[PDB]
Structure 1
């Protein structure tokens, strides 16, 4: 991997760490909410997966008394990580010059 590519890879790993925290706060961010739906720790992790990828299909979601920000904060983490990889995108075309002479 390239220097810039390594940075993007590092950012991806950071997102995974957040999911672990999301899976937890998710259990508590429901146990005691009006109309709750996200219960159980084994299933709470799965919900965490479908959200950090900026894809809120639905399935399960936090209420209000459970700091709705629980999901918002987790999702935002993904935006920054997937947004940083840009440093590796703006260089995607730049290589065209190297490809010209095969540098």
Structure 2
């Protein structure tokens, strides 16, 4: 792997790389709160979906860490198709998960482009 990390020697080449490092140095805190917020959001919607869809014919929602994949698939609006809710009470919390992720991730994305 680490034979790629020499790609950062491009730092002295493009202004943008170093300037981006400096922007992150500026955004040391807000990113931490991003981490925390998305963490608890993941956990909550994972648990909800799980118990909502744990009992089903083809429940792929075996474990909570087997629904983290789903909650971060939808919470980021990817939508692969591997894990889909099927109960009338998994649909709803998945849909709400989508919007919830939209809102929670979009708090820093303006602060970062402003910086």
Is TM > 0.5 for Structure 1 vs Structure 2?
A: yes
CA distance in 2, matches of 1:71, 1:36: 17
Q: Structure 1: which 5+ residue stretches go unaligned?
A: 93-103
Which of 49, 53, 56 does residue 30 from structure 1 map onto?
53
Q: Which runs of 4+ in 1 moved over 4 A?
A: none
Where 1:7 maps in the other structure, the secondary structure is helix
Task: Give how far 1:64 is off.
Answer: 4.4
Task: Give how far 1:20 is off.
Answer: 1.0
Q: 1:78 to 1:17 in 2, by over 3 A?
A: same
Q: TM-score, normalised by structure 2?
A: 0.60
Structure number with higher helix proportion: 2
Which of 4, 7, 12 does residue 35 from structure 2 map onto?
12
Q: Is the 8 A contact 1:52 1:77 kept in 2?
A: yes
Task: Give how far 1:87 is off.
Answer: 2.3
What is the root-mean-square deviation of aligned Cα atoms in Å?
Answer: 2.4
CA distance in 1, matches of 2:32, 2:97: 19
Match of 2:62 in 1: 40
Of the two structures, which has the highest relative contact order with CA contacts closer than 8 Å and spacing of 6 or more?
A: 1
Q: Structure 2: which 5+ residue stretches go unaligned?
A: 1-24
Where 1:28 maps in the other structure, the secondary structure is helix
